[PDB]
């Protein structure tokens, strides 16, 4: 037989997937975020990428129905900048925030069950003590 | 500020993306492979995943047109088992083959500009000498 594994591949393809999102190519979902009195914001993304990092997004998108293109999802109770940072983590595996936003990012991460950054935001808040 | 990076994330999300493909969930393209007298085969996949590992698939799918769901693509001149192994590499970053198939996998990899396994199949054939 013969087996080969490029360890760095998933990182590279994740980068191209993030490029297609920024170029708004091949996107099938638009997240319309309306939070309190802050201005509304739209984020286009790929359902399969969001589903691969968030079980909440996975159940939200796996409905057993054949979609016919762009689906609009209204998202409530989370600031647009926090949703953007979560979307960035799903595509790039990195997330950044000011120390006074770590609490809000954790709230959004708990809400969408992104365990990796829930644990990271929990760890940072504990050693602030 | 505050920055966090889960190195292992892209590998995990790639695994869930591969699971959604096997479950045929969130797929937007069906590859219908007809090669010589061999029986035809269908492979459902995600355009954004195939585009992230193959510039041929990326240009094929980024047309500037809003698609309305499942697109069917007829694929010629490559055996269904070779297309399956290439699809597997795009999702998992691993590819396996018998020594008498390394040549055919390279042909399909050159055809879809999957540089990583082109180089690997080229390396294996050279040390067969």
């Amino acid at each position: 037989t013969f087996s080969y594994t490029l360890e760095d591949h998933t990182k590279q393809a994740a980068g191209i997937m993030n490029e297609l999102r920024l170029s708004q190519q091949l996107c099938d979902v638009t997240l319309q975020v309306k939070y309190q009195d802050a201005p509304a914001a739209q984020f286009m993304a790929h359902k399969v990428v969001l589903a691969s990092s968030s079980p909440v997004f996975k159940a939200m998108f796996t409905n057993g129905l054949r979609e016919q293109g762009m689906e609009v999802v209204s998202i409530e109770g989370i600031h647009p900048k926090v949703m953007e940072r979560l979307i960035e983590f799903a595509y790039t595996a990195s997330i950044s925030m000011g120390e006074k936003c770590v609490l809000h990012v954790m709230n959004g991460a708990v809400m969408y069950q992104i365990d990796s950054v829930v644990r990271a935001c929990a760890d940072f808040l504990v050693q602030q003590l």
Side-chain angles (χ1 to χ4, degrees), chain A residues 18-37:
Chain A
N18 195 39
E19 296 174 3
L20 300 157
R21 176 182 69 90
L22 302 173
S23 305
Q24 293 173 15
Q25 286 170 313
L26 307 181
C27 294
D28 51 358
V29 62
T30 298
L31 302 191
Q32 290 182 342
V33 179
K34 192 60 178 63
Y35 182 69
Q36 262 143 51
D37 49 2

mmCIF file with all atom_site columns, all heavy atoms in Angstrom, chain A residues 18-37:
data_model
loop_
_atom_site.group_PDB
_atom_site.id
_atom_site.type_symbol
_atom_site.label_atom_id
_atom_site.label_alt_id
_atom_site.label_comp_id
_atom_site.label_asym_id
_atom_site.label_entity_id
_atom_site.label_seq_id
_atom_site.pdbx_PDB_ins_code
_atom_site.Cartn_x
_atom_site.Cartn_y
_atom_site.Cartn_z
_atom_site.occupancy
_atom_site.B_iso_or_equiv
_atom_site.pdbx_formal_charge
_atom_site.auth_seq_id
_atom_site.auth_comp_id
_atom_site.auth_asym_id
_atom_site.auth_atom_id
_atom_site.pdbx_PDB_model_num
ATOM 1   N N   . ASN A 1 18 ? -11.260 31.049 4.361  1.00 0.00 ? 18 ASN A N   1
ATOM 2   C CA  . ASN A 1 18 ? -11.444 32.385 4.916  1.00 0.00 ? 18 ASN A CA  1
ATOM 3   C C   . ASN A 1 18 ? -11.373 33.453 3.833  1.00 0.00 ? 18 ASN A C   1
ATOM 4   O O   . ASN A 1 18 ? -12.058 34.476 3.933  1.00 0.00 ? 18 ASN A O   1
ATOM 5   C CB  . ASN A 1 18 ? -10.400 32.653 6.000  1.00 0.00 ? 18 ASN A CB  1
ATOM 6   C CG  . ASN A 1 18 ? -10.744 33.858 6.855  1.00 0.00 ? 18 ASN A CG  1
ATOM 7   O OD1 . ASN A 1 18 ? -11.908 34.087 7.185  1.00 0.00 ? 18 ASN A OD1 1
ATOM 8   N ND2 . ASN A 1 18 ? -9.730  34.640 7.213  1.00 0.00 ? 18 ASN A ND2 1
ATOM 9   N N   . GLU A 1 19 ? -10.556 33.235 2.800  1.00 0.00 ? 19 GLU A N   1
ATOM 10  C CA  . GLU A 1 19 ? -10.482 34.192 1.703  1.00 0.00 ? 19 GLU A CA  1
ATOM 11  C C   . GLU A 1 19 ? -11.788 34.234 0.920  1.00 0.00 ? 19 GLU A C   1
ATOM 12  O O   . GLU A 1 19 ? -12.269 35.315 0.564  1.00 0.00 ? 19 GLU A O   1
ATOM 13  C CB  . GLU A 1 19 ? -9.313  33.845 0.782  1.00 0.00 ? 19 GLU A CB  1
ATOM 14  C CG  . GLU A 1 19 ? -7.947  33.945 1.437  1.00 0.00 ? 19 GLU A CG  1
ATOM 15  C CD  . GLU A 1 19 ? -6.831  33.448 0.540  1.00 0.00 ? 19 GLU A CD  1
ATOM 16  O OE1 . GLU A 1 19 ? -7.119  33.078 -0.617 1.00 0.00 ? 19 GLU A OE1 1
ATOM 17  O OE2 . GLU A 1 19 ? -5.666  33.425 0.992  1.00 0.00 ? 19 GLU A OE2 1
ATOM 18  N N   . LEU A 1 20 ? -12.373 33.066 0.640  1.00 0.00 ? 20 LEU A N   1
ATOM 19  C CA  . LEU A 1 20 ? -13.643 33.022 -0.073 1.00 0.00 ? 20 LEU A CA  1
ATOM 20  C C   . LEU A 1 20 ? -14.751 33.708 0.713  1.00 0.00 ? 20 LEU A C   1
ATOM 21  O O   . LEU A 1 20 ? -15.667 34.284 0.115  1.00 0.00 ? 20 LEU A O   1
ATOM 22  C CB  . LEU A 1 20 ? -14.017 31.572 -0.377 1.00 0.00 ? 20 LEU A CB  1
ATOM 23  C CG  . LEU A 1 20 ? -13.016 30.801 -1.241 1.00 0.00 ? 20 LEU A CG  1
ATOM 24  C CD1 . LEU A 1 20 ? -13.152 29.304 -1.016 1.00 0.00 ? 20 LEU A CD1 1
ATOM 25  C CD2 . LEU A 1 20 ? -13.206 31.144 -2.711 1.00 0.00 ? 20 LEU A CD2 1
ATOM 26  N N   . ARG A 1 21 ? -14.689 33.656 2.046  1.00 0.00 ? 21 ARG A N   1
ATOM 27  C CA  . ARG A 1 21 ? -15.674 34.358 2.860  1.00 0.00 ? 21 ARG A CA  1
ATOM 28  C C   . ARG A 1 21 ? -15.516 35.868 2.725  1.00 0.00 ? 21 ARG A C   1
ATOM 29  O O   . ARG A 1 21 ? -16.500 36.588 2.518  1.00 0.00 ? 21 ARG A O   1
ATOM 30  C CB  . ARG A 1 21 ? -15.547 33.934 4.324  1.00 0.00 ? 21 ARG A CB  1
ATOM 31  C CG  . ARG A 1 21 ? -16.471 34.699 5.261  1.00 0.00 ? 21 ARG A CG  1
ATOM 32  C CD  . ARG A 1 21 ? -16.273 34.285 6.710  1.00 0.00 ? 21 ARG A CD  1
ATOM 33  N NE  . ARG A 1 21 ? -14.983 34.720 7.239  1.00 0.00 ? 21 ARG A NE  1
ATOM 34  C CZ  . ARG A 1 21 ? -14.781 35.888 7.842  1.00 0.00 ? 21 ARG A CZ  1
ATOM 35  N NH1 . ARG A 1 21 ? -15.785 36.741 7.989  1.00 0.00 ? 21 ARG A NH1 1
ATOM 36  N NH2 . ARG A 1 21 ? -13.576 36.203 8.297  1.00 0.00 ? 21 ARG A NH2 1
ATOM 37  N N   . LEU A 1 22 ? -14.282 36.365 2.849  1.00 0.00 ? 22 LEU A N   1
ATOM 38  C CA  . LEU A 1 22 ? -14.040 37.798 2.723  1.00 0.00 ? 22 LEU A CA  1
ATOM 39  C C   . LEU A 1 22 ? -14.414 38.298 1.334  1.00 0.00 ? 22 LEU A C   1
ATOM 40  O O   . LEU A 1 22 ? -14.929 39.413 1.184  1.00 0.00 ? 22 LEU A O   1
ATOM 41  C CB  . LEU A 1 22 ? -12.576 38.110 3.032  1.00 0.00 ? 22 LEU A CB  1
ATOM 42  C CG  . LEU A 1 22 ? -12.079 37.681 4.415  1.00 0.00 ? 22 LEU A CG  1
ATOM 43  C CD1 . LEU A 1 22 ? -10.578 37.885 4.542  1.00 0.00 ? 22 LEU A CD1 1
ATOM 44  C CD2 . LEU A 1 22 ? -12.820 38.436 5.508  1.00 0.00 ? 22 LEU A CD2 1
ATOM 45  N N   . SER A 1 23 ? -14.163 37.489 0.307  1.00 0.00 ? 23 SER A N   1
ATOM 46  C CA  . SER A 1 23 ? -14.590 37.805 -1.049 1.00 0.00 ? 23 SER A CA  1
ATOM 47  C C   . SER A 1 23 ? -16.074 37.549 -1.272 1.00 0.00 ? 23 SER A C   1
ATOM 48  O O   . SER A 1 23 ? -16.577 37.840 -2.363 1.00 0.00 ? 23 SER A O   1
ATOM 49  C CB  . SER A 1 23 ? -13.772 36.997 -2.060 1.00 0.00 ? 23 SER A CB  1
ATOM 50  O OG  . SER A 1 23 ? -12.384 37.202 -1.872 1.00 0.00 ? 23 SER A OG  1
ATOM 51  N N   . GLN A 1 24 ? -16.774 37.009 -0.270 1.00 0.00 ? 24 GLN A N   1
ATOM 52  C CA  . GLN A 1 24 ? -18.203 36.704 -0.362 1.00 0.00 ? 24 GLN A CA  1
ATOM 53  C C   . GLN A 1 24 ? -18.500 35.782 -1.542 1.00 0.00 ? 24 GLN A C   1
ATOM 54  O O   . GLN A 1 24 ? -19.466 35.978 -2.283 1.00 0.00 ? 24 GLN A O   1
ATOM 55  C CB  . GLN A 1 24 ? -19.037 37.984 -0.436 1.00 0.00 ? 24 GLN A CB  1
ATOM 56  C CG  . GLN A 1 24 ? -18.986 38.812 0.839  1.00 0.00 ? 24 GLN A CG  1
ATOM 57  C CD  . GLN A 1 24 ? -19.674 40.152 0.695  1.00 0.00 ? 24 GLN A CD  1
ATOM 58  O OE1 . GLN A 1 24 ? -20.423 40.380 -0.255 1.00 0.00 ? 24 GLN A OE1 1
ATOM 59  N NE2 . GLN A 1 24 ? -19.420 41.051 1.638  1.00 0.00 ? 24 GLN A NE2 1
ATOM 60  N N   . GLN A 1 25 ? -17.662 34.764 -1.711 1.00 0.00 ? 25 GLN A N   1
ATOM 61  C CA  . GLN A 1 25 ? -17.830 33.759 -2.749 1.00 0.00 ? 25 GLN A CA  1
ATOM 62  C C   . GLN A 1 25 ? -18.244 32.435 -2.121 1.00 0.00 ? 25 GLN A C   1
ATOM 63  O O   . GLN A 1 25 ? -17.720 32.044 -1.072 1.00 0.00 ? 25 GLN A O   1
ATOM 64  C CB  . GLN A 1 25 ? -16.537 33.582 -3.555 1.00 0.00 ? 25 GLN A CB  1
ATOM 65  C CG  . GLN A 1 25 ? -16.253 34.726 -4.520 1.00 0.00 ? 25 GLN A CG  1
ATOM 66  C CD  . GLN A 1 25 ? -14.863 34.655 -5.126 1.00 0.00 ? 25 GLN A CD  1
ATOM 67  O OE1 . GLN A 1 25 ? -13.874 34.450 -4.421 1.00 0.00 ? 25 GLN A OE1 1
ATOM 68  N NE2 . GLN A 1 25 ? -14.779 34.827 -6.440 1.00 0.00 ? 25 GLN A NE2 1
ATOM 69  N N   . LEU A 1 26 ? -19.199 31.759 -2.764 1.00 0.00 ? 26 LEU A N   1
ATOM 70  C CA  . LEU A 1 26 ? -19.709 30.451 -2.358 1.00 0.00 ? 26 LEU A CA  1
ATOM 71  C C   . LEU A 1 26 ? -20.445 30.485 -1.023 1.00 0.00 ? 26 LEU A C   1
ATOM 72  O O   . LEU A 1 26 ? -20.676 29.432 -0.419 1.00 0.00 ? 26 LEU A O   1
ATOM 73  C CB  . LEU A 1 26 ? -18.587 29.404 -2.307 1.00 0.00 ? 26 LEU A CB  1
ATOM 74  C CG  . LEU A 1 26 ? -17.719 29.237 -3.558 1.00 0.00 ? 26 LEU A CG  1
ATOM 75  C CD1 . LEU A 1 26 ? -16.682 28.144 -3.345 1.00 0.00 ? 26 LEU A CD1 1
ATOM 76  C CD2 . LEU A 1 26 ? -18.573 28.938 -4.780 1.00 0.00 ? 26 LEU A CD2 1
ATOM 77  N N   . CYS A 1 27 ? -20.833 31.667 -0.549 1.00 0.00 ? 27 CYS A N   1
ATOM 78  C CA  . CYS A 1 27 ? -21.540 31.781 0.719  1.00 0.00 ? 27 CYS A CA  1
ATOM 79  C C   . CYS A 1 27 ? -23.009 31.417 0.552  1.00 0.00 ? 27 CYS A C   1
ATOM 80  O O   . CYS A 1 27 ? -23.637 31.749 -0.457 1.00 0.00 ? 27 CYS A O   1
ATOM 81  C CB  . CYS A 1 27 ? -21.417 33.200 1.277  1.00 0.00 ? 27 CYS A CB  1
ATOM 82  S SG  . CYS A 1 27 ? -19.740 33.676 1.746  1.00 0.00 ? 27 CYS A SG  1
ATOM 83  N N   . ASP A 1 28 ? -23.560 30.735 1.559  1.00 0.00 ? 28 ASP A N   1
ATOM 84  C CA  . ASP A 1 28 ? -24.945 30.287 1.512  1.00 0.00 ? 28 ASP A CA  1
ATOM 85  C C   . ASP A 1 28 ? -25.757 30.725 2.726  1.00 0.00 ? 28 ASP A C   1
ATOM 86  O O   . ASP A 1 28 ? -26.913 30.310 2.863  1.00 0.00 ? 28 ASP A O   1
ATOM 87  C CB  . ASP A 1 28 ? -25.010 28.761 1.362  1.00 0.00 ? 28 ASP A CB  1
ATOM 88  C CG  . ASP A 1 28 ? -24.152 28.034 2.381  1.00 0.00 ? 28 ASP A CG  1
ATOM 89  O OD1 . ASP A 1 28 ? -23.473 28.708 3.185  1.00 0.00 ? 28 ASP A OD1 1
ATOM 90  O OD2 . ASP A 1 28 ? -24.157 26.784 2.377  1.00 0.00 ? 28 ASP A OD2 1
ATOM 91  N N   . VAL A 1 29 ? -25.194 31.551 3.605  1.00 0.00 ? 29 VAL A N   1
ATOM 92  C CA  . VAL A 1 29 ? -25.921 32.050 4.769  1.00 0.00 ? 29 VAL A CA  1
ATOM 93  C C   . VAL A 1 29 ? -25.447 33.465 5.070  1.00 0.00 ? 29 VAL A C   1
ATOM 94  O O   . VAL A 1 29 ? -24.258 33.779 4.945  1.00 0.00 ? 29 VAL A O   1
ATOM 95  C CB  . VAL A 1 29 ? -25.747 31.120 5.992  1.00 0.00 ? 29 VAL A CB  1
ATOM 96  C CG1 . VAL A 1 29 ? -24.285 31.033 6.409  1.00 0.00 ? 29 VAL A CG1 1
ATOM 97  C CG2 . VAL A 1 29 ? -26.618 31.590 7.153  1.00 0.00 ? 29 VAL A CG2 1
ATOM 98  N N   . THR A 1 30 ? -26.389 34.324 5.451  1.00 0.00 ? 30 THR A N   1
ATOM 99  C CA  . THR A 1 30 ? -26.101 35.688 5.877  1.00 0.00 ? 30 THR A CA  1
ATOM 100 C C   . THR A 1 30 ? -26.601 35.860 7.303  1.00 0.00 ? 30 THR A C   1
ATOM 101 O O   . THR A 1 30 ? -27.795 35.688 7.570  1.00 0.00 ? 30 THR A O   1
ATOM 102 C CB  . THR A 1 30 ? -26.760 36.714 4.953  1.00 0.00 ? 30 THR A CB  1
ATOM 103 O OG1 . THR A 1 30 ? -26.243 36.569 3.626  1.00 0.00 ? 30 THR A OG1 1
ATOM 104 C CG2 . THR A 1 30 ? -26.487 38.127 5.449  1.00 0.00 ? 30 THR A CG2 1
ATOM 105 N N   . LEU A 1 31 ? -25.691 36.191 8.215  1.00 0.00 ? 31 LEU A N   1
ATOM 106 C CA  . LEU A 1 31 ? -26.040 36.413 9.614  1.00 0.00 ? 31 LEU A CA  1
ATOM 107 C C   . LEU A 1 31 ? -26.337 37.895 9.811  1.00 0.00 ? 31 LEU A C   1
ATOM 108 O O   . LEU A 1 31 ? -25.433 38.733 9.731  1.00 0.00 ? 31 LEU A O   1
ATOM 109 C CB  . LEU A 1 31 ? -24.914 35.951 10.535 1.00 0.00 ? 31 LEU A CB  1
ATOM 110 C CG  . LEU A 1 31 ? -24.483 34.488 10.428 1.00 0.00 ? 31 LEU A CG  1
ATOM 111 C CD1 . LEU A 1 31 ? -23.557 34.125 11.579 1.00 0.00 ? 31 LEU A CD1 1
ATOM 112 C CD2 . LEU A 1 31 ? -25.689 33.565 10.394 1.00 0.00 ? 31 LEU A CD2 1
ATOM 113 N N   . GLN A 1 32 ? -27.603 38.218 10.061 1.00 0.00 ? 32 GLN A N   1
ATOM 114 C CA  . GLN A 1 32 ? -28.029 39.587 10.327 1.00 0.00 ? 32 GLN A CA  1
ATOM 115 C C   . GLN A 1 32 ? -28.116 39.769 11.837 1.00 0.00 ? 32 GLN A C   1
ATOM 116 O O   . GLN A 1 32 ? -29.004 39.208 12.489 1.00 0.00 ? 32 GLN A O   1
ATOM 117 C CB  . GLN A 1 32 ? -29.361 39.888 9.645  1.00 0.00 ? 32 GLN A CB  1
ATOM 118 C CG  . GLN A 1 32 ? -29.261 39.963 8.127  1.00 0.00 ? 32 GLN A CG  1
ATOM 119 C CD  . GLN A 1 32 ? -30.579 40.310 7.466  1.00 0.00 ? 32 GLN A CD  1
ATOM 120 O OE1 . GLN A 1 32 ? -31.643 40.180 8.069  1.00 0.00 ? 32 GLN A OE1 1
ATOM 121 N NE2 . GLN A 1 32 ? -30.515 40.751 6.214  1.00 0.00 ? 32 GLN A NE2 1
ATOM 122 N N   . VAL A 1 33 ? -27.192 40.549 12.389 1.00 0.00 ? 33 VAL A N   1
ATOM 123 C CA  . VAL A 1 33 ? -27.020 40.691 13.830 1.00 0.00 ? 33 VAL A CA  1
ATOM 124 C C   . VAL A 1 33 ? -27.585 42.040 14.253 1.00 0.00 ? 33 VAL A C   1
ATOM 125 O O   . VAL A 1 33 ? -27.101 43.091 13.816 1.00 0.00 ? 33 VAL A O   1
ATOM 126 C CB  . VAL A 1 33 ? -25.544 40.562 14.233 1.00 0.00 ? 33 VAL A CB  1
ATOM 127 C CG1 . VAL A 1 33 ? -25.387 40.735 15.730 1.00 0.00 ? 33 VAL A CG1 1
ATOM 128 C CG2 . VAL A 1 33 ? -24.988 39.216 13.784 1.00 0.00 ? 33 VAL A CG2 1
ATOM 129 N N   . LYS A 1 34 ? -28.606 42.009 15.108 1.00 0.00 ? 34 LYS A N   1
ATOM 130 C CA  . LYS A 1 34 ? -29.224 43.210 15.662 1.00 0.00 ? 34 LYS A CA  1
ATOM 131 C C   . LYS A 1 34 ? -29.161 43.105 17.181 1.00 0.00 ? 34 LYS A C   1
ATOM 132 O O   . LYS A 1 34 ? -29.818 42.242 17.773 1.00 0.00 ? 34 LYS A O   1
ATOM 133 C CB  . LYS A 1 34 ? -30.664 43.363 15.175 1.00 0.00 ? 34 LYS A CB  1
ATOM 134 C CG  . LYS A 1 34 ? -31.269 44.725 15.463 1.00 0.00 ? 34 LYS A CG  1
ATOM 135 C CD  . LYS A 1 34 ? -30.475 45.826 14.779 1.00 0.00 ? 34 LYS A CD  1
ATOM 136 C CE  . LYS A 1 34 ? -31.095 47.191 15.017 1.00 0.00 ? 34 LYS A CE  1
ATOM 137 N NZ  . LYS A 1 34 ? -31.095 47.553 16.461 1.00 0.00 ? 34 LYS A NZ  1
ATOM 138 N N   . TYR A 1 35 ? -28.377 43.980 17.809 1.00 0.00 ? 35 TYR A N   1
ATOM 139 C CA  . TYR A 1 35 ? -28.111 43.906 19.242 1.00 0.00 ? 35 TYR A CA  1
ATOM 140 C C   . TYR A 1 35 ? -28.401 45.254 19.888 1.00 0.00 ? 35 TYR A C   1
ATOM 141 O O   . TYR A 1 35 ? -27.672 46.225 19.656 1.00 0.00 ? 35 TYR A O   1
ATOM 142 C CB  . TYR A 1 35 ? -26.667 43.480 19.507 1.00 0.00 ? 35 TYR A CB  1
ATOM 143 C CG  . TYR A 1 35 ? -26.327 43.328 20.972 1.00 0.00 ? 35 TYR A CG  1
ATOM 144 C CD1 . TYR A 1 35 ? -26.878 42.302 21.727 1.00 0.00 ? 35 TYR A CD1 1
ATOM 145 C CD2 . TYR A 1 35 ? -25.448 44.202 21.599 1.00 0.00 ? 35 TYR A CD2 1
ATOM 146 C CE1 . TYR A 1 35 ? -26.569 42.152 23.066 1.00 0.00 ? 35 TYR A CE1 1
ATOM 147 C CE2 . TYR A 1 35 ? -25.133 44.060 22.938 1.00 0.00 ? 35 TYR A CE2 1
ATOM 148 C CZ  . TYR A 1 35 ? -25.696 43.033 23.666 1.00 0.00 ? 35 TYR A CZ  1
ATOM 149 O OH  . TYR A 1 35 ? -25.386 42.888 24.999 1.00 0.00 ? 35 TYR A OH  1
ATOM 150 N N   . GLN A 1 36 ? -29.458 45.305 20.699 1.00 0.00 ? 36 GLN A N   1
ATOM 151 C CA  . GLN A 1 36 ? -29.809 46.470 21.527 1.00 0.00 ? 36 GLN A CA  1
ATOM 152 C C   . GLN A 1 36 ? -29.942 47.691 20.619 1.00 0.00 ? 36 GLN A C   1
ATOM 153 O O   . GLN A 1 36 ? -30.683 47.627 19.624 1.00 0.00 ? 36 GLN A O   1
ATOM 154 C CB  . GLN A 1 36 ? -28.791 46.593 22.656 1.00 0.00 ? 36 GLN A CB  1
ATOM 155 C CG  . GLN A 1 36 ? -29.267 46.004 23.976 1.00 0.00 ? 36 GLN A CG  1
ATOM 156 C CD  . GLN A 1 36 ? -28.159 45.318 24.751 1.00 0.00 ? 36 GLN A CD  1
ATOM 157 O OE1 . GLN A 1 36 ? -27.087 45.883 24.966 1.00 0.00 ? 36 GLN A OE1 1
ATOM 158 N NE2 . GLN A 1 36 ? -28.414 44.083 25.173 1.00 0.00 ? 36 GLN A NE2 1
ATOM 159 N N   . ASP A 1 37 ? -29.269 48.802 20.911 1.00 0.00 ? 37 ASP A N   1
ATOM 160 C CA  . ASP A 1 37 ? -29.325 49.999 20.085 1.00 0.00 ? 37 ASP A CA  1
ATOM 161 C C   . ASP A 1 37 ? -28.145 50.114 19.130 1.00 0.00 ? 37 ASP A C   1
ATOM 162 O O   . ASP A 1 37 ? -28.072 51.087 18.371 1.00 0.00 ? 37 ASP A O   1
ATOM 163 C CB  . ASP A 1 37 ? -29.397 51.246 20.974 1.00 0.00 ? 37 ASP A CB  1
ATOM 164 C CG  . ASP A 1 37 ? -28.348 51.241 22.071 1.00 0.00 ? 37 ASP A CG  1
ATOM 165 O OD1 . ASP A 1 37 ? -27.539 50.291 22.121 1.00 0.00 ? 37 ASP A OD1 1
ATOM 166 O OD2 . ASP A 1 37 ? -28.335 52.188 22.887 1.00 0.00 ? 37 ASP A OD2 1
#
